[PDB]
Amino acid sequence: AKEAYAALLLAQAFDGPEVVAGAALGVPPLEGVEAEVENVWGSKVPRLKATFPDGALLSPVGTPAYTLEASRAFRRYAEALIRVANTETRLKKIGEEIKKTTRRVNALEQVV
Amino acid sequence: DDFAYLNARVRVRRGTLLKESFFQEALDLSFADFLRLLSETVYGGELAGQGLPDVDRAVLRTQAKLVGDLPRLVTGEAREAVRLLLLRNDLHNLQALLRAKATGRPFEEVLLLPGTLREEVWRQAYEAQDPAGMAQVLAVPGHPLARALRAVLRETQDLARVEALLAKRFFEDVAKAAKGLDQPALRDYLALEVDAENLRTAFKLQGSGLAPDAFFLKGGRFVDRVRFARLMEGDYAVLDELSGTPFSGLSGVRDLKALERGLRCVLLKEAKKGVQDPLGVGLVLAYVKEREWEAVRLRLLARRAYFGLPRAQVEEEVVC
Amino acid sequence: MAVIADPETAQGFRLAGLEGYGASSAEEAQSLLETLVERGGYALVAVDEALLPDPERAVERLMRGRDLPVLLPIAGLKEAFQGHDVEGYMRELVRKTIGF
């Protein structure tokens, strides 16, 4: 992704600007949060995945080349950035639980 | 028409076209060291801080006076060819202005490139109502796109179509206008640019499924409607029929990155013939385009140096 | 939805979606944090290693039980990133859960 990110400046040093002007808001760029319920103890907690369309071509016709190639990286970015957004948050939550459970374990196990 | 002034200037400026070993050197002289290197060369008078963004700006101003000048004189044949160059940078601005104006982005993040209309005129054009009003701003200093846009606006004033037609139409208009300038060298570069443009459109839009003519732009040579169709619907074999042309280098390459790379080399080589034509347009093409290609290389190498990236990955990417 | 890194690198974001913002205008980003929550239609916010994705307390002070984007690790740009990859995984497991 970053390959093209800096490469696409070829003379596009300020036609990034142009291209975002000329082409953007042409594949969905905001909204698509699905709040999810899953096992949550005590006073409840939501998790979620926010996925909705987000990366391809949207410019009219060919227009510059680096544009198209760069926007293609978003396909590979956006999408991927979602997986870690949704696994890494699950991971830490279930972590707490894991701990919190062992907490009671302790009290019960050697207090009561 | 004027080659008196014109030629004498062109000969001096070519004297500061960096030595090949410079371009080798910058690769291995780190970002600080790069900053020194640029500053000791002619672009250096615009080393205005010291950092990567500073390189980009130094290039803009250094080119602005050195290339942006030729249309700024009179309107001989060469100036007309160059006018097309300034027009391409404008065109990019013009597309941005159309989507920006309709979708509520301010003028302010549009940053003008060197242009045939003055900035305050541009400011007035953005501020000048509908695309008709905008076009009306454009028509005043002498501009074939102004009328071209106006003709498009009678047929529809739906933005997306206006964009679609804006690229398509500007280059259809240029093609005929350029064809009347009446001597082989200018015609030859123009024709080769057509082949290349058709080739890139077909590659990039592949699988959008339409007819070759649905996206074909006139001027053909070795890149024709049949080839356009075959690839755009999907098939590489098109690239194997471009052997037996000056664009021989597509027959051992297949990707888009490599595609632009090869194409860029051929056009440079083609540009290199014109030192046997100091009173032909051959010399102006070679010099002006060369100053741009120098610019490409300075800027990439600036980035490479800034970010410390793998050497073998970028060294090729400024070499033919 | 939203992210931040330097402007100079940010642009890429700015192409398809990622209606990002600068990230060298604050070395606290709290400023941005709140601004982000003004609309709150962005369920995703992530940051470089420029800051650090360890003092989340800003978020806790603002959301205060209204889980809104977990700040995620990016990293300024690759130049190596895989070394501290297998590390970022291990760095987590010991201080979470149990120490080995």
Curated annotation (Swiss-Prot), chain A:
Keywords: ATP synthesis, Hydrogen ion transport, Ion transport, Transport. The keyword Glycoprotein does not apply. GO terms for molecular function: ATP binding; proton-transporting ATP synthase activity, rotational mechanism; proton-transporting ATPase activity, rotational mechanism. It comes from the Bacteria. Produces ATP from ADP in the presence of a proton gradient across the membrane. Belongs to the V-ATPase D subunit family. This is V-type ATP synthase subunit D. It comes from Thermus thermophilus (strain ATCC 27634 / DSM 579 / HB8).
Swiss-Prot record, chain B:
One of its GO terms (biological process) is proton motive force-driven plasma membrane ATP synthesis. One of its GO terms (cellular component) is proton-transporting V-type ATPase, V0 domain. Gene3D superfamilies: ATP synthase (C/AC39) subunit, domain 3 (1.10.132.50), V-type ATP synthase subunit C domain (1.20.1690.10). One of its GO terms (molecular function) is proton-transporting ATP synthase activity, rotational mechanism. Disulfide bonds: none annotated. It holds the Pfam family vATP-synt_AC39. The keyword Transport applies. Signal peptide: none annotated. Keywords: ATP synthesis, Hydrogen ion transport, Ion transport, Transport. HAMAP family: ATP_synth_C_arch (MF_00314). Belongs to the V-ATPase V0D/AC39 subunit family. Produces ATP from ADP in the presence of a proton gradient across the membrane. This is V-type ATP synthase subunit C. The gene is atpC.
Swiss-Prot record, chain C:
SUPFAM superfamilies: AtpF-like. Keywords: ATP synthesis, Hydrogen ion transport, Ion transport, Transport. InterPro entries: ATPase_V1-cplx_f_g_su, ATPase_V1-cplx_fsu_bac/arc, ATPase_V1_fsu_sf. It holds the Pfam family ATP-synt_F. One of its GO terms (biological process) is proton motive force-driven plasma membrane ATP synthesis. One of its GO terms (molecular function) is proton-transporting ATP synthase activity, rotational mechanism. Belongs to the V-ATPase F subunit family. Produces ATP from ADP in the presence of a proton gradient across the membrane. This is V-type ATP synthase subunit F. It comes from Thermus thermophilus (strain ATCC 27634 / DSM 579 / HB8). The lineage of its organism: Bacteria, Thermotogati, Deinococcota, Deinococci, Thermales.
